[PDB]
Amino acid sequence: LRTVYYNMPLPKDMIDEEGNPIMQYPRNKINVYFLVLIILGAFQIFGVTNPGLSAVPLVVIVIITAIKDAIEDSRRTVLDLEVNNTKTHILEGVENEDCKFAKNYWKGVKVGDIVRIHNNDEIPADIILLSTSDTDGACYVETKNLDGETNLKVRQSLKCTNTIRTSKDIARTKFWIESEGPHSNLYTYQGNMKWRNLADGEIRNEPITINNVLLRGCTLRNTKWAMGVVMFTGGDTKIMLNSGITPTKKSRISRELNFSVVINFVLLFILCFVSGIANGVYYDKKGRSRFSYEFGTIAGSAATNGFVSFWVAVILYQSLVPISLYISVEIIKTAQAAFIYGDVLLYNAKLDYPCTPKSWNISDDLGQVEYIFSDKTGTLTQNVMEFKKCTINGVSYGRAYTEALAGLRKRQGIDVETEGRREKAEIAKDRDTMIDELRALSGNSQFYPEEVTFVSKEFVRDLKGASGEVQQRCCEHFMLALALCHSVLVEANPDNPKKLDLKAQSPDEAALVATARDVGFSFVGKTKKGLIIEMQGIQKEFEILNILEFNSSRKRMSCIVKIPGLNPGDEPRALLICKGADSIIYSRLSRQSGSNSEAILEKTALHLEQYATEGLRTLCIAQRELSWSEYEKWNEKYDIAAASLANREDELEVVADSIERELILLGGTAIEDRLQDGVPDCIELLAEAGIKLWVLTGDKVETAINIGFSCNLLNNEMELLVIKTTGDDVKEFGSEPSEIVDALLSKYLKEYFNLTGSEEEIFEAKKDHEFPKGNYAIVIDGDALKLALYGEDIRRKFLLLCKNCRAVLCCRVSPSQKAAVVKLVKDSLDVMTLAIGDGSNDVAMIQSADVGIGIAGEEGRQAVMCSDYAIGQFRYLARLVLVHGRWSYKRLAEMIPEFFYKNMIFALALFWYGIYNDFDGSYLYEYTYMMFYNLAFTSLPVIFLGILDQDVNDTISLVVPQLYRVGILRKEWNQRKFLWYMLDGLYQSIICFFFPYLVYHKNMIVTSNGLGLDHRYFVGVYVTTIAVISCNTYVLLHQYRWDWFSGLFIALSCLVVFAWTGIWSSAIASREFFKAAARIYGAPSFWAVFFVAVLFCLLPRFTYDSFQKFFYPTDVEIVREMWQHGHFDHYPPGYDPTDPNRPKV
Amino acid sequence: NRRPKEDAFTQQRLAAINPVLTPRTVLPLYLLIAVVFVIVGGCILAQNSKVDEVTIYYQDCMTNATSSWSDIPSEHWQFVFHKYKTYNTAPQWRFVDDESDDFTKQRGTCQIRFTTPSDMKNNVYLNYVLEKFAANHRRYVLSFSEDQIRGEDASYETVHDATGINCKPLSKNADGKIYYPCGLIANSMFNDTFPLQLTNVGDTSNNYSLTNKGINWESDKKRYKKTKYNYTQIAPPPYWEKMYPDGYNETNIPDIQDWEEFQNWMRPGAFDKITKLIRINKNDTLPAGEYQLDIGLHWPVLEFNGKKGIYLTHGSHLGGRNPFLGIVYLIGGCICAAMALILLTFWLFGGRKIADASSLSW
Ligand SMILES: *[C@@H]1O[C@H](CO)[C@@H](O[C@@H]2O[C@H](CO)[C@@H](O[C@@H]3O[C@H](CO)[C@@H](O)[C@H](O)[C@@H]3O)[C@H](O)[C@H]2NC(C)=O)[C@H](O)[C@H]1NC(C)=O
Ligand SMILES: Nc1ncnc2c1ncn2[C@@H]1O[C@H](COP(=O)(O)OP(=O)(O)CP(=O)(O)O)[C@@H](O)[C@H]1O
Ligand SMILES: *[C@@H]1O[C@H](CO)[C@@H](O[C@@H]2O[C@H](CO)[C@@H](O)[C@H](O)[C@H]2NC(C)=O)[C@H](O)[C@H]1NC(C)=O
Ligand SMILES: *[C@@H]1O[C@H](CO[C@@H]2O[C@H](CO)[C@@H](O)[C@H](O)[C@H]2NC(C)=O)[C@@H](O)[C@H](O)[C@H]1NC(C)=O
Ligand SMILES: [Mg+2]
Secondary structure (H helix, E strand, C coil), X not given: CCCCCCCCCCCCCCCCCCCCCCCCCCCCCCCHHHHHHHHHHHCCCCCCCCCCCCCCCCCHHHHCCHHHHCCCCCHHHHHHHHHCCCCCCXXXXXXXXXXXXXXXXXXXXXXXXXXXXXXXXXXXXXXXXXXCCCHHHCEECCCCCCCCCCCCCEECCCCCCCCCCCCCCCCCCCCCCCCCCCCCCCCCCCCCEEEECCCCCCEEEECCCCCCCCCCCCCCCCCCCCCCCECCCCCCCCCCCCCCCCCCCCCCCCCCHHHXXXXXXXXXXXXXXXXXHHHHHHHCCCCCCCCCCCCCCCCCCCCCCCCXXXXXXXXXXXXXXHHHHHHHHCCCHHHHHHHHHCCHHHCECCCCECCCCCCCCCCCCCCCCCEEEECCCCCCCCCCEEEEEEEECCEEECCCCCCHHHCCCCCCCCCCHHHHHHHHHHHHHCCCCCCCCCCCCXXXXXXXXXXXXXXXXXXXXXXXXXXXXXXXXXXXXXXXXXXXXCCCEECCCCCCCCCCCEECXXXXXXXXXXXXXXXXXXXXXXXXXXXXXXXXXXXXXXXXXXXXXXXXXXXXXXXXXXXXXXXXCCCCCEXXXXXXXXXXXXXXXXXXXXXXXXXXXXXXXXXXXXXXXXXXXXXXXXXXXECCCCHXXXXXXXXXXCCCCCCCCHHHHHHHXXXXXXXXXXXXXXXXXXXXXXXXHHHHHHCCCCCEEEEECCCCHHHHHHHHHHCCCCCCCEEEECCCCCCCCCCCCCCCCCCCCCHHHHHHHCCCCCCCCCCCCCCCCCCCCCCCCCCCEEEECCHHHHCCCCCXXXXXXXXXXXXXXXXXXXXXXXXXXXXXXXXXXXXXXXXXXXXECCCCCCCHXXXXXXXXXXXXXXXXXXXXXXXXXXXXXXXXXXXXXXCCCHHHHHHHHHHCCCCHHHHHHHHCHHHHCCCCCCCCCCCCCCCCCCCCHHHHHCCHHHHHHHHHCCCCCCCHHHHCHHHHHHHHCCCCCCHHHHHHHHHHHHHHHHHHHHHHHHHCXXXXXXXXXXXXXXXXXXXXXXXXXHHHHHHCHHHHHHCCCCEHHHHHHHHHHHCHHHHHHHHXXXXXXXXXXXXXXXXXXXXXXXXXXXXXXXXXXXXXXXXXXXXXXXXXXXXXHHHHHHHHCXXXXXXXXXXCCCXXXXXXX | CCCCCCXXXXXXXXXXXXXXXXXXXXXXXXXXHHHHHHHHHXXXXXXXXXXXXXXXXXXXXXXXXXXXXXXXXXCCCEEECCCCXXXXXXXXXXXXXXXXXXXXXXXXXEEEEEEECCCECCCCEEEEEEECCCCCCCCCCCCCCHHHHCXXXXXXXXXXXXXXXXXXXXXXXXXXXXXXXXXXXXXXXXXXXXXXXXXXXXXXXXXXXXXXXXXXXXXXXXXXXXXXXXXXXXXXXXXXXXXCCCCCCCCCCCCCCCCHHHHHHCCCECCCEEEEEEEECCCCCECCEEEEEEEECCCCCCCCCCEEEEEXXXXXXXXCCCCHHHHXXXXXXXXXXXXXXXXXXXXXXXXXXXXXXXXXXX
């Protein structure tokens, strides 16, 4: 039960069943702050530490899990900061009787709290409108928070209740509204909104339809104000329960980051244990200075085996380093993903749209991709259709020369020869049509070979027919049924009232009716009961009553029509027209007619496979006359399915399946489908970089092969597997040689592929990230994909054959099989996948991958919301992956080992001083060199290496794509590289300590004037300064791209240790650290142990890099060698090969 | 328009130099650091070999000395003179007496007579060295009162329970009197009486005067101030109870703004060897001759086997005679010349051409 209330004070302190917060109602809050306060409270700012060793896992197990997942999920907190704190003046805290707006709190809005809308306000709750601020309720929305659709859809309220808009009728309602609960849907919501009038007190109705649907994600644009109550506020709705199932996609470096943090704490816990036991060994010696001049007891075990409450505070101070890590990588990942947004070369200027990241923290998953799962149309195809060829009554008529060049490879001398007299052919005859609404500018889709040869094949030879030219009556029945069966509507553009345009969801139906109104048969109107089509100008209305819908797991759509009374005294029978894929129409045909399996049906399939190797997307047209007696035997079967609750799942499909059982073939149809610009340059640029690209299409095998050549996916490699039969597995036990259809999948994958490659069943040497040497390619019929993913030990034969091949063309693949093959490669291998594609039928492929790219601008902006990046066309993927992904992988694979390095060069000399004060617990550093080291001293150059380091230029990343193959092989982030930076940080911590120690190891004066500076806090200026400079100039030597912006902020981080010492240790409040600027920096022994300890820190590693990039260089050193010698100087800046207008060079 | 801003920063086109470490760049970089640190290391050890010093330990003067002039055994004294590298005329002590009315653990003047065959040039510093005394423990270095260092009338509940640095074991005695220098640092000073003149025995009886002013930084007189207590609410710390045997009178309140031996002691040294300046003479030259300083023993170390000492030197610009800082420039110049010959013998017998050796083509 869902309720709403008014004329009730709605208390928060009511115990009885009269208010909201008892029944588990949603609250808008969609701990942490106390924990970070007491960590700073324990480390000696104010307060005391926690007693004993009662938190050595209890700090660690919360700090790698609870305040990792809170910092790494800061993307949605800023998205929550889109919900709250956009605040304006509202109508929340208003009594029942206060006629004036009051400034209040947005997340305090109540179920039934009426708020007047304004300009630029996100609608905070499920409001229900009754009156608009515009005439006729014309409300056109702008919905950046609901869906990717940044364009128009109609919001229309009922006409009679738009007049009531004054605010002097507030107290008229006293009841709750009848609605359905949240049931996890996005677009569909049919409710029932009844309320009551003012003047007398009578109730009236206002049924909400799809036009007046309102949601929390809605944002009502281009209206001024409206007055209506709200229903749902909080976290229980329909726009938020479709999501929330997702685990928000932590990246791969951000999931192996916890092995690095734990083995840091294990090194800390060894040091705070060896110290704590050698502290108690000191106290059990009974011959020390501690007895007389200190007032210590004659005992050991100071707290628990010596002073360990010191080393608790050392453990708890080093816990501020992982919190400093996740804040650092979430201002690098956020900044790397704001540079993807701000790139002008990822900008789609045709439809005004930059590359928008929907997930600001997976930018390094783009740099390790060896599987891209593509859809075919809409993404590798600009998805505007053009009707070319058709077959009627078996015989084909209709030609074209559009992209036969991808099939006519060698036998090509036909540059202009066919297209010359082709243009002469259509211009000489196609003026002689005789029908209304012939628009010859757009009418050149099917240029007339022959339909009637403009003489109509008159009826004077046979009034009764059946003696010749029955194709003339068959072709008119074809293009009628091609125009009649659709889902396209009629509108009128304001440019010309006579000329009418047609828009549809599926661009086939836009293209099928376009030629259908070129040769008679003008589809001009859509009646609420009928349908208006002028057959050769003669108007006659057809009433449709069942439109069988189309989703991509069905692969056909059907429609019914009632033939009006043409014979005297009889209501004639009905007719169904079904169009769809030929792989499902030939399976559903008649076996009792005269037009059965003979040459008249065999050459239709011969022509359509000839149309698909031509490159066109095929489709079949099929009908059956339904008898009027058996017509109303299945209409009432929709009363238990379509009129009931089950009108959206498989009970409606199986009751639609019973009518489509056998049909008769009417004809076929083929459609030109052009490619997007730069797709043959984008696939060719990704397949150089070692990425194994798949194409998960949904249409016929011979189409996607010919598209696969003209997009440069195939060179000469193909190896095909097909079911070549019509049976399935109905078995349960046995019968493996007797039954065929999975036996010839087992014998084809095993026994015919010991030839090229020699493999078997399971062995754990199965993870080899190399790009395969011998080029081969699987093309698979999809019905042979259901049989190769049905059981275990046959899905490992499909996966081990597709591991070893450069391209996979999965054809006739349902959208449930698209997502099943993505998560098969994803989990059973240790690989990282991308899934680019548009369309509402392509969202489970995107969500089941690691990165999901969504093509916008096309028919589907449903795949843009479930995506992570949202590029405009396809050709921006090679700029996204090879430039902004390959950079963003090597940036995060260098600042992570240089964050645990810079810890140990400083915070490990608190241990090396431990062996001289006998592990007792005097801090070497003065109280603010511990606060400001990892925060202000050395914290910025690892941020500007994560953000602004680039190994080569953005031109050279595309000219040499094979520099991406380092991240595919996982050679920049392994756990061996991490341990060498901790050994380099442990070497330079004995340099930064024992070089200031040996100036004081005879412990004389180290000053020019003899006055002496030998306090703990003055050795920790020798130690701190040569640690700050030697891990800020270690950053400068290990980055490429010495620009001016990073080198200036390394210089200002190298001189901020000299500047905070000059300010804090001249201030009077710094006790016993008082003129340490003018005492230490003015000492000539500071500036002589400075230049030789900064050397010895940088000396083993700059020599090793010199030995590494002379004799065993990387591929990114050798590219940087050639770039100084002018091999890349003729390429212009701002370069991309995936562009049709910029020249070659 | 929703087109992003092309300003050569969001396009990541900042001006850069892009360093490539080819062996025509870093091989002159290695022979440049080598010919700096070898030459600077020769100019430090030429300076740091001319520094002379005198170290005499005297912790075993009450027990292992006679009442006549006997030579110090060689385990205590060591002194280095650069003009006279072979010099073995040992200094001689003379314990004066157990003066018969004292605390009988260290008492009586320890007279020490040494010989200097050089000229300690202008600033002749006299330190004192202290070995195996732990002034860097945890509770020790955190026990004083900064408001009493700065000279305020802090209450009992201001020196006792302040956060961080409070004088926790030592804040009152029995009678409500706050110890005015409170904490383990001020309670446990060094209180031998060094002389204010090196007695020029033998030569001429023209003394060498040593002053105890300017012994610390002259910028320490801003956080060290004289106090304003009332001479009836304070009492000396319990190891100062042989210097103020009756208590504090109207006059004997220690001016710690001016008493600069105390200001040296209230910075606890960081390691287990302590050298603090206690005598100086910025005026004259210390000529060659046989001198005598006479230390009145008051501060005991032999109950923990510590050491007490004398450190008479003219300093340097890098401090005192510590030969580390000039050796390590020679090591940092020989390694940068070793690791330039390792990477030039390997490069000739070895080496690459500098284009198109990629694994991409392989
Ligand atoms: C200054 O020099 C004097 C010697 O002239 C050093 O002697 C310290 O004087 C205190 C006075 O209370 C003595 O402590 C004594 O302890 C034992 C056993 O508890 C007992 O004989 C007495 O009852 C008295 O409490 C002791 O002579 C000595 N303290 C020690 C050795 O710890 C004093 O250390 C020097 N002070 C400074 C600040 O340098
Ligand atoms: N509006 C429509 N009416 C009838 N048939 C259609 C149709 N749209 C597509 N079809 C046919 O249904 C078949 C399967 O539909 P599906 O939607 O899976 O193809 P598709 O267009 O999505 C290819 P892709 O997977 O690359 O997007 C296609 O071969 C197509 O010919
Ligand atoms: C207060 O105490 C100080 C020392 O604690 C006194 O100084 C000494 O006084 C004695 C006389 O009792 C004399 O020997 C000297 O004047 C001082 N001794 C030394 C060794 O110098 C001071 O006189 C006391 N003042 C009062 C008013 O009692
Ligand atoms: C300079 O030193 C001489 C040292 O001469 C001793 O003087 C004392 C009396 O002062 C006498 O008893 C000794 O016998 C002398 N000789 C020796 C070898 O000890 C002193 O006069 C003063 O310390 C200083 N003189 C002046 C004027 O400052
Ligand atoms: Mg699509």
